[PDB]
Enzyme design. Structure first.
Site, PDB file in Angstrom:
ATOM      1  CD1 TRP A 119      -2.573   1.963   1.520  1.00  0.00           C
ATOM      2  CD2 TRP A 119      -3.267   0.430   0.040  1.00  0.00           C
ATOM      3  NE1 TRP A 119      -3.774   2.399   1.020  1.00  0.00           N
ATOM      4  CE2 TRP A 119      -4.222   1.472   0.106  1.00  0.00           C
ATOM      5  CE3 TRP A 119      -3.485  -0.666  -0.795  1.00  0.00           C
ATOM      6  CZ2 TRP A 119      -5.395   1.456  -0.623  1.00  0.00           C
ATOM      7  CZ3 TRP A 119      -4.678  -0.697  -1.528  1.00  0.00           C
ATOM      8  CH2 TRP A 119      -5.590   0.348  -1.457  1.00  0.00           C
ATOM      9  CG  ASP A 175      -1.136  11.990  -2.495  1.00  0.00           C
ATOM     10  OD1 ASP A 175      -0.621  10.857  -2.706  1.00  0.00           O
ATOM     11  OD2 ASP A 175      -2.050  12.376  -3.243  1.00  0.00           O
ATOM     12  CD  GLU A 178      -5.184   5.475   0.270  1.00  0.00           C
ATOM     13  OE1 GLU A 178      -6.134   4.972  -0.263  1.00  0.00           O
ATOM     14  OE2 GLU A 178      -4.688   5.036   1.309  1.00  0.00           O
ATOM     15  CD  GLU A 179      -3.658   8.973  -7.013  1.00  0.00           C
ATOM     16  OE1 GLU A 179      -3.512  10.172  -7.142  1.00  0.00           O
ATOM     17  OE2 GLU A 179      -4.546   8.293  -7.597  1.00  0.00           O
ATOM     18  CD  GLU A 399     -13.697   7.301  -4.843  1.00  0.00           C
ATOM     19  OE1 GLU A 399     -13.481   6.957  -6.013  1.00  0.00           O
ATOM     20  OE2 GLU A 399     -12.989   6.955  -3.923  1.00  0.00           O
TER      21      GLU A 399
END
Ligand SMILES: *[C@@H]1O[C@H](CO)[C@@H](O[C@@H]2O[C@H](CO)[C@@H](O[C@@H]3O[C@H](CO[C@H]4O[C@H](CO[C@H]5O[C@H](CO)[C@@H](O)[C@H](O)[C@@H]5O)[C@@H](O)[C@H](O[C@H]5O[C@H](CO)[C@@H](O)[C@H](O)[C@@H]5O)[C@@H]4O)[C@@H](O)[C@H](O[C@H]4O[C@H](CO)[C@@H](O)[C@H](O)[C@@H]4O[C@H]4O[C@H](CO)[C@@H](O)[C@H](O)[C@@H]4O)[C@@H]3O)[C@H](O)[C@H]2NC(C)=O)[C@H](O)[C@H]1NC(C)=O
Ligand SMILES: *[C@@H]1O[C@H](CO)[C@@H](O[C@@H]2O[C@H](CO)[C@@H](O[C@@H]3O[C@H](CO)[C@@H](O)[C@H](O[C@H]4O[C@H](CO)[C@@H](O)[C@H](O)[C@@H]4O[C@H]4O[C@H](CO)[C@@H](O)[C@H](O)[C@@H]4O)[C@@H]3O)[C@H](O)[C@H]2NC(C)=O)[C@H](O)[C@H]1NC(C)=O
Ligand SMILES: *[C@H]1O[C@H](CO)[C@@H](O)[C@H](O)[C@@H]1O
Ligand SMILES: *[C@H]1O[C@H](CO)[C@@H](O)[C@H](O)[C@@H]1O
Ligand SMILES: *[C@H]1O[C@H](CO)[C@@H](O)[C@H](O)[C@@H]1O
Ligand SMILES: *[C@H]1O[C@H](CO)[C@@H](O)[C@H](O)[C@@H]1O
Ligand SMILES: *[C@H]1O[C@H](CO)[C@@H](O)[C@H](O)[C@@H]1O
Ligand SMILES: *[C@H]1O[C@H](CO)[C@@H](O)[C@H](O)[C@@H]1O
Ligand SMILES: *[C@H]1O[C@H](CO)[C@@H](O)[C@H](O)[C@@H]1O
Ligand SMILES: *[C@H]1O[C@H](CO)[C@@H](O)[C@H](O)[C@@H]1O
Ligand SMILES: *[C@H]1O[C@H](CO)[C@@H](O)[C@H](O)[C@@H]1O
Ligand SMILES: *[C@H]1O[C@H](CO)[C@@H](O)[C@H](O)[C@@H]1O
EC number: 3.2.1.3
Length: 470
Positions: A119, A175, A178-179, A399
């Site tokens: 992750w 960030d 998540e990237e 979303e």
């Protein structure tokens, strides 16, 4: 007529939907432990059936504010959250253990076990957000005479998270999206805020946070580097343009209703936050078919960043709402101050909305002020109309919403989407959060230093909660 009404209704659906996504009685998340906030009940395509420190932190701060304002029934929810966090803090995971980096772990399984696959870890905003959510409740506890709960349960938990922030703020990580592995505005901004409010809370319980005190001014110092002269850089170590709703979120989650239009802290009405708002929103105007035909004076559907390819890169409900929330926050601030100022930095923002804009100070009784505040409110509301337009008939908020047809896509019933509706609505109504002390924490040091301060780590055990009545 339509909007005002849709919102009253949506606020009710949003509150229910959130509770449906919290264990262990949440109707949509059977399997989640007690006090666990699930991102979404979607277990497949995409799989969001996990608990994120950021997501839960954000949702809980929102619930805490509702509670303090009278939604007394949220007490058990909050208490379950806190107790679940005492456990999570001590869970050994790929990021480490309690005292060795564990706190930066992004997500966990809903059963409170570690998520062991690959992750984008760590995410350092997590701990700052969790601490902010607890400090709010800890304040309530002190004010209503539950001093022992505040001192022996909340403080110790916050203490862990604050030691983490002070120790690692000056290191790269992922960030909020998540990237990107680097240094991110949102993260830095929420960390600064947590340290300041952690310090006041510590004193209030009769203790201290020396590490809060030494590091806060240094994070603030560093935060100044994200201003490019035109907009807020979302992240360092990125090849993207850097225009990202991350920066809008950063402003709104660090909004202090007692703050003026301070550029040092990037407040909603600060010239820099205003200039930034136009640059970020404008980046989505020509890339989404859904925005085709709208003029520069009109609200548009907003996504995360213009380069986004996630599910093809589409508008997000929470991003669109953040665009409106910042404006509602600025209106509040102007009203309280009794004036609005236009600078060379913010001229483009104002001129797009009120073509007769010119730099200067405008009192609240002035014709120019009335003209601008109306246009700003109309613009803010337009963002909300876009959401109303694309929400499901029963009020369900996804979303994302399709860049061409606006149909809902990606994770269904996203908890963060509902929390974002509640805060925007609150702000729209002049319901603001408690202050975090921005007024004694906006002074930038003369020289920024690349440093840290080590705090202290200790495992907390929540044996029992006193019989709190609200
Ligand atoms: C407003 O109304 C909407 C519309 O009804 C409400 O949403 C609906 O809520 C129910 C639950 O109350 C959800 O049920 C859950 O569905 C999933 C399966 O979902 C996938 O398939 C759906 C159907 O697929 C076929 O049919 C559709 C229908 O036209 C076709 O389009 C497809 O092509 C297929 O032919 C599909 O609708 C789902 O799409 C939705 O979600 C995706 C992905 O997130 C979105 O992109 C989509 O846009 C869309 O929103 C999806 O593709 C089941 O897996 C669930 O079963 C679990 O949970 C049950 C209890 O809740 C339990 O009995 C089951 O055993 C199973 O349990 C397992 O999973 C749980 C986690 O969720 C675990 O906790 C548990 O331990 C165990 O592991 C469930 O049946 C609907 O999907 C949802 N529908 C939509 C359209 O979103 C909405 O809630 C209402 N809102 C309000 C505010 O009230
Ligand atoms: C730990 O703390 C220290 C101390 O606070 C941090 O050090 C500071 O780091 C910032 C960020 O690098 C740095 O500012 C840079 O200074 C250079 C020289 O003056 C500038 O050339 C550089 O410009 C970039 O940012 C501008 C905005 O400030 C943009 O306008 C400009 O286009 C540049 O941005 C591009 O290039 C960067 C590369 O830096 C790239 O990653 C971007 O995505 C973008 O493409 C900065 O202004 C300060 O000078 C440093 N201060 C000191 C005292 O050294 C350190 O970064 C912290 N480390 C972590 C991991 O937190
Ligand atoms: C932010 O806080 C500083 C003090 O640290 C003030 O100087 C400024 O006016 C603003 O209130
Ligand atoms: C405002 O206060 C900061 C600390 O919060 C100082 O470092 C700065 O020099 C100014 O006095
Ligand atoms: C980082 O740097 C500061 C001052 O530059 C120190 O006070 C701190 O202990 C850490 O080494
Ligand atoms: C944070 O990192 C600094 C390095 O600048 C250490 O001096 C400090 O002890 C803490 O580990
Ligand atoms: C930072 O460093 C101090 C001093 O060794 C530790 O006590 C703390 O746990 C953290 O590692
Ligand atoms: C850091 O400080 C805390 C509280 O002051 C201790 O409980 C911990 O063991 C460490 O020494
Ligand atoms: C460190 O601090 C926590 C919180 O008071 C204790 O539970 C632990 O036993 C250790 O003293
Ligand atoms: C603090 O951490 C210990 C493990 O180090 C846990 O057992 C306890 O539940 C709390 O999370
Ligand atoms: C809270 O207290 C228990 C002991 O009562 C510990 O075992 C746990 O790790 C945490 O410190
Ligand atoms: C309840 O009881 C345990 C065991 O004594 C403590 O460790 C905990 O901190 C709480 O007071």
């Amino acid at each position: 007529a339509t909007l005002d009404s849709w919102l009253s209704n949506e606020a009710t659906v949003a509150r229910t939907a959130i509770l449906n996504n919290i264990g262990a009685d949440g109707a949509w998340v059977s399997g989640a432990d007690s006090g666990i906030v699930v991102a979404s009940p979607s277990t497949d395509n995409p799989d969001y059936f996990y608990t994120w420190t950021r997501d839960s932190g954000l949702v809980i701060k929102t619930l805490v504010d509702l509670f303090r304002n009278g939604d007394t029934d949220l007490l058990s929810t909050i208490e379950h959250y806190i107790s679940s966090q005492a456990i999570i803090q001590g869970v050994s995971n790929p990021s480490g253990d309690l005292s060795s980096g564990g706190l930066g772990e992004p997500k966990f399984n809903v059963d409170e076990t570690a998520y062991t696959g690959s992750w984008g870890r760590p995410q350092r905003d997590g701990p700052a957000l969790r601490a902010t959510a607890m400090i709010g409740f800890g304040q309530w506890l002190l004010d209503n005479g539950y001093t022992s709960a505040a001192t022996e349960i909340v403080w110790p938990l916050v203490r862990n998270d604050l030691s983490y922030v002070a120790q690692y703020w000056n290191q790269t990580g992922y960030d909020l999206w998540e990237e990107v592995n680097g240094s991110s505005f949102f993260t830095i901004a929420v960390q600064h805020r947590a340290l300041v409010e952690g310090s006041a809370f510590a004193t209030a319980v009769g203790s201290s946070c020396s590490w809060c005190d030494s590091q806060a001014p240094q994070i603030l110092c560093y935060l100044q580097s994200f201003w490019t002269g035109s907009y807020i850089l979302a992240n360092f170590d990125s090849s993207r343009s850097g225009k990202d709703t991350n920066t809008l979120l950063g402003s709104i989650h660090t909004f202090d209703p007692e703050a003026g239009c301070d550029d040092s802290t990037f407040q909603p009405c600060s010239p820099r936050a205003l200039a930034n708002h136009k640059e970020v929103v404008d980046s989505f105007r020509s890339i989404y078919t859904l925005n085709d035909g709208l003029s520069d004076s009109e609200a548009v559907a907003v996504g995360r960043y213009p380069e986004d390819s996630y599910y093809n890169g589409n508008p997000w409900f929470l991003c669109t709402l953040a665009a409106a929330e910042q404006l509602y926050d600025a209106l509040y601030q102007w009203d309280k101050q009794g004036s609005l100022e236009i600078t060379d930095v913010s001229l483009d923002f104002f001129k797009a909305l009120y073509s007769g804009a010119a730099t200067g100070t405008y009192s609240s009784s002035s014709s120019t002020y009335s003209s601008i505040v109306s246009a700003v409110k109309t613009f803010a509301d337009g963002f909300v109309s876009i959401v109303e337009t694309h929400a499901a008939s029963n009020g369900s908020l996804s979303e994302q919403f399709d860049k061409s047809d606006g149909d809902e896509l990606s994770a269904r019933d996203l908890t963060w989407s509902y929390a974002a509706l509640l805060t925007a609505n609150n702000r729209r109504n002049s319901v603001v959060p408690p202050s975090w002390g921005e007024t004694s924490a906006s002074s930038v040091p003369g020289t920024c230093a690349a440093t840290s301060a080590s705090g202290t780590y200790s495992s907390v055990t929540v044996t029992s909660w006193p019989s709190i009545v609200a």
